[PDB]
User: Fold this.
Amino acid sequence: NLQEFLGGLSPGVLDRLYGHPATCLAVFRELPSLAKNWVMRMLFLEQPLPQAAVALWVKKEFSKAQEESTGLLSGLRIWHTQLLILNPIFRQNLRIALLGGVPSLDKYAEERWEVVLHFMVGSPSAAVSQDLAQLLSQAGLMKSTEPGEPPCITSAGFQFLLLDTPAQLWYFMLQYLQTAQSRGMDLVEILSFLFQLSFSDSLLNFLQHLREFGLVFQRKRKSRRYYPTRLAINQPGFIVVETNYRLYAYTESELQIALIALFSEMLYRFPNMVVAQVTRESVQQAIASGITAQQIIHFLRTRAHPVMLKQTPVLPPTITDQIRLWELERDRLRFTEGVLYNQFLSQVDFELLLAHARELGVLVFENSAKRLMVVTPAGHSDVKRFWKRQKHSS
Amino acid sequence: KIVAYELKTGGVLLHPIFNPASHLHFSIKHPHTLSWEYYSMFQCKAHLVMRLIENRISMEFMLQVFNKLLSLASTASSQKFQSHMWSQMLVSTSGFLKSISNVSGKDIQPLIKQWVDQSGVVKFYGSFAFNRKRNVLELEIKQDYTSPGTQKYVGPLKVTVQELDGSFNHTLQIEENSLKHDIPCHSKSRRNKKKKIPLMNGEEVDMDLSAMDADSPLLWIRIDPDMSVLRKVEFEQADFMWQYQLRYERDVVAQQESILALEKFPTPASRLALTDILEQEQCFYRVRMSACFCLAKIANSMVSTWTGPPAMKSLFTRMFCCKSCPNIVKTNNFMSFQSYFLQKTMPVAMALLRDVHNLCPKEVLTFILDLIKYNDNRKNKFSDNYYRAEMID
Assistant:
């Protein structure tokens, strides 16, 4: 979430990111319930106040809200104890932010995201863009390994595909920012634009990428002015599920049919409907590709036709249980690197060695009944030395 | 005794050649210049080297050597010629080796050259590792040959490995550049079924295999079990292997060395092992007398963990006191000669118990004083002087 993204930041980047135009307001809206009230209170105070007052300024009931809000805003570093006055820069910017100093667009965003997903899946016809392809490849959801051949889809790719559009886009933009820092694009400048949307060379490239994603559209041969789409700020279902593992989806866009075929066997395709079967073969194929039953169940539930909404639960218990059992049927091997010792002599002496590999992060599996500790070869030169020291101590 | 003396000061040189031994402060050319401790260790090393010659050339051939010497002497002892034949009553080293070579056809000149003419004992440091993939046991035996009393051994070396399929002997060739010796290991199909594990002798016993490793079949290893060299072994087993070697071995020197090596592992499984040795008649009595002192040392080391009464007290009241009165000792009947020795050695080890304050507990001192007060010896056919003297000790 955006709260996680902002919490994972340093004070030096935080105060700079608190730009005058929008950031002080976008981060304010994040404040879930009560911290808004305290920010408004001590927006006009130039004198810090004791912490005991803030502690006792919430009744005994519902105090956990007080502690959680205080911790969240301490992490955000909106104020400092100074002994709880707010940061002067944030106070000034917030005062400046508080009395101081379309139908075609949504369709465009939908179509652009749909073609992006078409390219993501193995669609022969899709929009071509080398920058988009390499960005998706380095986002961790795609791997090519051969420039001549079109890139394939990794295991995480299917999971990302089956996610809903809001979370899908949000995670995609999170990965975009994380890779922006890697490629060298300043994070603060690009981040501030997202906040400003909900109200330079790097800016132009970032806006080009956003337009490729379909969140914005200049509409004037790439002019300075832009008109953000609905997705920039941040529908009825069509699938009918039977009790015999049969799906009737009122789908005209090929994207939905492809998504359903990812985990179902298609039987018929009518102009305004398509018939598929959820069989062991298709479900286990999806599970092997990497999906888990939770994504499939959530996808079918969110794309649930209004006819089946009346029944509770919306998705039949037999279908849900069958999908879950099919996914459980498979349990899979793992991969790690390690080295094992033996002849550990005294018992109380083996317990002290277990804490050496656990603190360094090179321990995989321990055994106090046989004395059997696995150590990765990456930290083999540090565990052996410790063992030698212990032997010397005797 | 001899490895302690030879590592302490130089070494004992049987058969010197005329100084041959300059590492020690007296001359070994005459018996009246020898130190008395050197004379005692000389006789001790001489009879151990004769046991080694019996190990190479069997005991019946050895008794035939001695009978040939005695028979030459007794044919010599009846002549009247003034020493034409009376010098057959005098033995030498060359005559003894020649009589050995006459009766057996083997000469012992490497063994004589190593253990007589050379004046040193050997030190063995062993450690093992079990290779689960190739099912082998990789021993690692290194010698300390740079100490002042030591020498380098290059002969063969017997090792006895007790695995789940039984006890197997292996001969290792320990040349100068040798360090790793790979010996093969057998199955672990006596852990699949509960079957009895066969011992060094022909018998077999039920073992509790819960402490054993799941991947290794081997229960214990003994380097040079028959004491066929003049050696000091320092083997690094795991503590459960020492406990299995204390419980189920049919060799008293291995039970003694496992008692000696269990003092470094104060775990409660070792306390259970020594307590099961102490309760066990049909164990040799000098092993139980050592297990008393080992149990006292282990009990001193695991204070602030010890649960019930002090060590060996409940065991003393179970073995040697009345059933109706626990604190009154039974009247003295010393006719068993093994529970007499164990009874007179158990409070002596029990008095080495110490509390968290480093003072002997007043539960053991009161127990010893009640052993002294309630002592009645008007009924046995034996005297009480050694038992009362051990009570004062």
User: Anything to note?
Assistant: Strands of chain A lie at 142-143, 152-153, 216-217, 227-228, 239-241, 246-249, 265-270, 273-277, 339-340, 374-375. The CA atoms of residues 294 and 324 of chain A lie 8 Å apart. Chain A has 20 helices and ten strands.
